[PDB]
């Protein structure tokens, strides 16, 4: 586990991060896929959380990977990195033209087939319902098309990097997803599928049946993006570019800058309700033009077709959470003449998106400062009447977790570093008054927050709880004094240390750019919480810093029974049985061989909590990049034990 850093004192935070880089990309280390050059989530391949295996790799994880190198051309002068990320990027976890057969018969008239969401698993699948439900027009599914053609430029949020379901060829990397029945399908009560469904494992409908009720199943293709991840690639990228001209090497990125331009323009996907309909209707109206933009990331985008025949379809999402907004990213497309989308409409979309954001954050501000969850164009995922005295923002339904209820999904702290962190960017680069009242607050609310002690440790909030409401949205903000948060735990996270740290020097930075003085506690602050993650946590060996952590919930590796509809059955490519009954473990049998198996089973057996220390890519990441903006902004500043 963690041991305490040798660090001198006086050490510049720019070697700080030349270190920890150093670190990050040593092959010896293994962050990163020996074959491809993929990153991992971490290190460990027993883990759950988002991803349920270690060694799958996500599009955040790419987005972090992006960022990584982003800094270090900025502190060094070397921009190959930024170019070999985004390679890796496009050649694996950005489904291809081969990989999106039949895109090209999509109608933005009939976009999909509407479907209901369920308040638990055990109600899937869910019936798709060709007959009495009209969906709404695609709006921009043509300009996107005019400009870049028939395909999608986003990234798939998951890829099984080593083919460790079994579900491809050999050792081949491999598109697959999980979540995909309702607010109260966790990490443990899924059921992990293949992308590409032909059928090879599984059932007699390889996965299909399990979450889609159709009149008849055919092999096709689907996939699903998680927003926040582009928008963090490309906010990478915009520093990427910054940082290259005023060296003189903007064209060490040029290319990147327009894959990441056009990445943007496709985020206008994620700007529609689930089914095109009416923002604000309660009801299943379907919609013309914009009037089924939300103009907000909702939790994904969804598209897919047919492997055999062509036909296809694309969904938005009705649910937006506060955490997955970047307000920064939409400012870049929306404005920044390198980042100028190439559709007619993008630039447009994007002016009026970027500044609905950033209404999301304010009329999300608890009394406290914490953001709250966000909203929902679609109560209960089947389009309902608001119940009684529901507090609205432009027609759609405040909710205190959008998505997941299991665990509530602004349950984490860790959005609130996330998302703030996009928001003080842009204040750092527009100035924008509009804004500073919420990140005062907010700021003010997490300084009193995070503890530091008198033997050089720290914690910060780890779980949140909230209550009440905010005020329904006027354009501005009331103080939504019945809106509250509470910290219910603190730990030591050592990533949301990081992007907490980044936050605050960030925001610091920018009052020394825009107000009458620098803020020197935020400042400090950052420096505090950099100081005291890499002294208190430094890996011995040599792989960075390092997490040690109490798993309760790995108890339900063995507890949680995962829902397998009655009558149904199927196997997975290793001979698991899916049936009913089965628990977490039974379908992921692999598990057994790995390292840390026995740590968490003889836990289970004593009645304990395992003790687990990690390596997660985007910890490590998050990390060196708030060393890399204190070297940037505060280049005076250098590391001393706390």
Same mark, same amino acid.
């Given at each position: 586990?963690?041991?305490?850093?040798?660090? @001198?004192?006086?050490?510049?935070?720019?070697?700080?991060?030349?270190?920890?880089?150093?670190?990050?990309?040593?092959? !010896?280390?293994?962050?990163?896929?020996?074959?491809?050059?993929?990153?991992?989530?971490?290190?460990?391949?027993?883990?759950?959380?988002?991803?349920?295996?270690?060694?799958? /790799? =996500? #599009?955040?994880?790419?987005?972090?990977?992006?960022?990584?190198?982003? $800094?270090?051309?900025?502190?060094?002068?070397?921009?190959?990195?930024?170019?070999?990320?985004?390679?890796?990027?496009?050649?694996?976890?950005?489904?291809?033209? /081969?990989?999106?057969?039949? $895109?090209?018969?999509?109608?933005?008239?009939?976009?999909?087939?509407?479907?209901?969401?369920?308040?638990?698993?055990?109600?899937?699948?869910?019936?798709?319902?060709?007959?009495?439900?009209?969906?709404?027009?695609?709006?921009?599914?043509?300009?996107?098309?005019?400009?870049?053609?028939?395909?999608?430029?986003?990234?798939?949020?998951?890829?099984?990097?080593?083919?460790?379901?079994?579900?491809?060829?050999?050792?081949?990397?491999?598109? %697959?997803?999980?979540?995909?029945?309702?607010?109260?399908?966790?990490?443990?009560?899924?059921?992990?599928?293949? #992308?590409?469904?032909?059928?090879?494992?599984?059932?007699?409908?390889?996965?299909?049946?399990?979450?889609?009720?159709?009149?008849?199943?055919?092999?096709?293709?689907?996939?699903?993006?998680?927003? *926040?991840?582009?928008?963090?690639?490309?906010?990478?990228?915009?520093?990427?570019? !910054?940082?290259?001209?005023?060296?003189?090497?903007?064209?060490?990125?040029?290319?990147?800058?327009?894959?990441?331009?056009?990445?943007?323009?496709?985020?206008?996907?994620?700007?529609?309700?689930?089914?095109?309909?009416?923002?604000?209707?309660?009801?299943?109206?379907?919609?013309?033009?914009?009037?089924?933009?939300?103009?907000? $990331?909702?939790?994904?985008?969804?598209?897919?077709?047919?492997?055999?025949?062509?036909?296809?379809?694309?969904?938005?999402?009705?649910?937006?959470?506060?955490?997955?907004?970047?307000?920064?990213?939409?400012?870049?497309?929306?404005?920044?003449? *390198?980042?100028?989308?190439?559709?007619?409409?993008?630039?447009? *979309?994007?002016?009026?998106?970027?500044?609905?954001?950033?209404?999301?954050?304010?009329?999300?501000?608890?009394?406290?400062?914490? %953001?709250?969850?966000?909203? =929902?164009?679609?109560?209960?995922?089947?389009?309902?009447?608001?119940?009684?005295?529901? #507090?609205?923002?432009?027609?759609?339904?405040?909710?205190?977790?959008?998505?997941?209820?299991?665990?509530? #999904?602004?349950?984490?702290?860790?959005?609130?570093?996330?998302?703030?962190?996009?928001?003080?960017?842009?204040?750092?680069? /527009?100035?924008?008054?509009?804004?500073?009242?919420? %990140?005062?607050?907010?700021?003010?609310?997490?300084?009193?927050?995070? @503890?530091?002690?008198?033997?050089?440790? +720290?914690?910060?909030?780890?779980? &949140?709880?909230?209550?009440?409401?905010?005020?329904?949205?006027?354009?501005?903000?009331?103080?939504?004094?019945? &809106?509250?948060?509470?910290?219910?735990?603190?730990?030591?996270?050592?990533?949301?240390?990081?992007? &907490?740290?980044?936050?605050?020097?960030?925001?610091?930075?920018?009052?020394?750019?825009?107000?009458?003085?620098?803020?020197?506690?935020?400042?400090?602050?950052?420096?505090?919480?950099?100081?005291?993650?890499?002294?208190?946590?430094?890996?011995?060996?040599?792989?960075?810093?390092?997490?040690?952590?109490?798993?309760?919930?790995?108890?339900? +590796? +063995?507890?949680?029974?995962?829902?397998?509809?009655?009558?149904?059955?199927?196997?997975?490519?290793?001979?698991?049985?899916?049936?009913?009954?089965? @628990?977490?473990?039974?379908?992921?049998?692999?598990?057994?061989?790995?390292?840390?198996?026995? %740590?968490?089973?003889?836990?289970?057996?004593?009645?304990?909590?395992?003790?687990?220390?990690?390596?997660?890519?985007?910890?490590?990441?998050?990390?060196?990049?708030?060393?890399?903006?204190?070297?940037?902004?505060?280049?005076?500043?250098?590391?001393?034990?706390?």
């Amino acid at each position: 586990g963690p041991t305490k850093a040798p660090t @001198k004192d006086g050490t510049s935070y720019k070697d700080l991060f030349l270190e920890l880089y150093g670190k990050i990309k040593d092959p !010896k280390n293994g962050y990163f896929s020996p074959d491809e050059g993929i990153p991992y989530h971490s290190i460990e391949t027993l883990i759950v959380e988002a991803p349920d295996y270690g060694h799958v /790799t =996500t #599009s955040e994880a790419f987005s972090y990977y992006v960022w990584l190198e982003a $800094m270090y051309g900025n502190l060094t002068g070397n921009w190959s990195g930024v170019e070999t990320a985004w390679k890796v990027m496009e050649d694996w976890i950005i489904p291809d033209s /081969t990989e999106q057969p039949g $895109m090209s018969s999509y109608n933005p008239n009939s976009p999909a087939t509407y479907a209901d969401e369920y308040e638990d698993p055990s109600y899937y699948p869910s019936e798709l319902k060709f007959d009495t439900v009209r969906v709404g027009s695609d709006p921009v599914h043509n300009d996107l098309v005019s400009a870049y053609g028939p395909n999608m430029y986003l990234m798939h949020w998951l890829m099984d990097v080593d083919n460790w379901y079994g579900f491809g060829t050999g050792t081949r990397a491999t598109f %697959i997803n999980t979540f995909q029945r309702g607010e109260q399908e966790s990490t443990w009560e899924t059921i992990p599928h293949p #992308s590409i469904e032909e059928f090879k494992y599984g059932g007699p409908n390889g996965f299909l049946d399990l979450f889609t009720k159709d009149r008849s199943y055919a092999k096709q293709w689907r996939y699903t993006n998680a927003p *926040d991840a582009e928008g963090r690639a490309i906010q990478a990228v915009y520093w990427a570019n !910054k940082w290259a001209k005023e060296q003189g090497k903007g064209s060490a990125v040029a290319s990147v800058v327009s894959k990441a331009a056009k990445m943007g323009d496709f985020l206008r996907n994620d700007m529609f309700d689930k089914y095109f309909m009416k923002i604000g209707a309660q009801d299943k109206t379907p919609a013309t033009g914009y009037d089924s933009a939300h103009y907000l $990331m909702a939790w994904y985008t969804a598209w897919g077709g047919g492997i055999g025949a062509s036909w296809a379809w694309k969904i938005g999402c009705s649910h937006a959470h506060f955490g997955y907004q970047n307000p920064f990213q939409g400012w870049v497309s929306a404005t920044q003449s *390198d980042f100028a989308p190439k559709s007619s409409n993008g630039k447009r *979309d994007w002016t009026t998106s970027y500044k609905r954001q950033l209404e999301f954050y304010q009329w999300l501000q608890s009394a406290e400062g914490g %953001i709250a969850g966000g909203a =929902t164009n679609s109560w209960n995922g089947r389009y309902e009447k608001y119940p009684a005295g529901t #507090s609205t923002f432009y027609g759609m339904a405040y909710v205190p977790h959008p998505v997941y209820a299991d665990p509530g #999904s602004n349950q984490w702290f860790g959005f609130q570093a996330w998302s703030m962190q996009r928001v003080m960017e842009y204040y750092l680069e /527009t100035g924008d008054s509009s804004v500073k009242n919420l %990140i005062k607050k907010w700021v003010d609310w997490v300084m009193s927050e995070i @503890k530091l002690y008198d033997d050089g440790t +720290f914690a910060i909030p780890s779980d &949140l709880e909230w209550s009440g409401q905010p005020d329904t949205w006027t354009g501005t903000y009331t103080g939504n004094p019945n &809106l509250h948060v509470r910290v219910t735990s603190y730990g030591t996270d050592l990533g949301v240390a990081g992007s &907490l740290a980044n936050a605050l020097a960030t925001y610091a930075a920018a009052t020394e750019r825009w107000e009458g003085k620098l803020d020197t506690k935020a400042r400090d602050m950052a420096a505090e919480l950099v100081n005291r993650a890499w002294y208190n946590f430094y890996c011995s060996e040599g792989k960075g810093v390092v997490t040690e952590e109490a798993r309760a919930d790995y108890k339900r +590796f +063995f507890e949680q029974e995962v829902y397998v509809p009655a009558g149904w059955s199927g196997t997975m490519p290793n001979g698991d049985k899916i049936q009913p009954g089965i @628990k977490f473990i039974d379908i992921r049998t692999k598990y057994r061989q790995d390292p840390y198996y026995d %740590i968490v089973y003889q836990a289970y057996l004593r009645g304990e909590a395992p003790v687990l220390n990690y390596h997660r890519f985007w910890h490590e990441v998050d990390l060196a990049v708030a060393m890399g903006v204190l070297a940037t902004y505060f280049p005076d500043m250098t590391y001393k034990v706390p």
